[PDB]
Design a binder for this molecule. Sequence first.
Ligand SMILES: [Zn+2]
Lengths: 192, 61
Amino acid sequence: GSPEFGTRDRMLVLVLGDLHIPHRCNSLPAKFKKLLVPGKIQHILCTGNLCTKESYDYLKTLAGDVHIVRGDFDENLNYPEQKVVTVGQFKIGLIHGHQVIPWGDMASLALLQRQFDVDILISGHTHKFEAFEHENKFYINPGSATGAYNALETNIIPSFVLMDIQASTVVTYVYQLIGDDVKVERIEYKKS
Amino acid sequence: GPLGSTEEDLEDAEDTVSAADPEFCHPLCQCPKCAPAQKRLAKVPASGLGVNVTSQDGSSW
Ligand SMILES: [Zn+2]
């Protein structure tokens, strides 16, 4: 048989944030630390605030290229309020979310997508995982990798998302820590 | 002798060997298999010598 394509440039990216360490949590959930490993992720996008630099060193260990945006509780003010990073054929924007009013409104997020002109928009602040499509655009919210506390939701589920991009198609994997075992769901999205 | 009168009946003349064959569920899962096999599930026994058999010192008796 013959090869479907000449070479492959697929790359996996890790998305998470709102760890709130050590403000509300001291570290990621035990099973998740086992799920994350260096040499497996080439790109890491962080939305929620670290906020302590100690967490930044941990993210750098999983991958060398890490992109982070300033959250409403980040100690380091040198982080960008929002950033647009291109990953292959996808143009992704990044922002914490506290600047979007109302905080978790979809119409407000969409209005921000236009200004950013990105195919995918990553944001958190609500600590609620969210992955849906709107008007040919994709929106993703990893939530809180440490299930950080949030006055608006009394039941937070810690979780992070990995995105696999082969080319013009992307598959996102979300890991939720429900009960002792970890459950995973698969969602696929493509420019077409 | 043999159940099949045909002299030839081997699907593969030679077998292959490998160190390990880990399976992946999704990104970041270097697990063994994440298979449901656990203490709740029992596997069919297939060992000749095991705890079921014990040894005694003839000189001691
Ligand atoms: Zn697995």
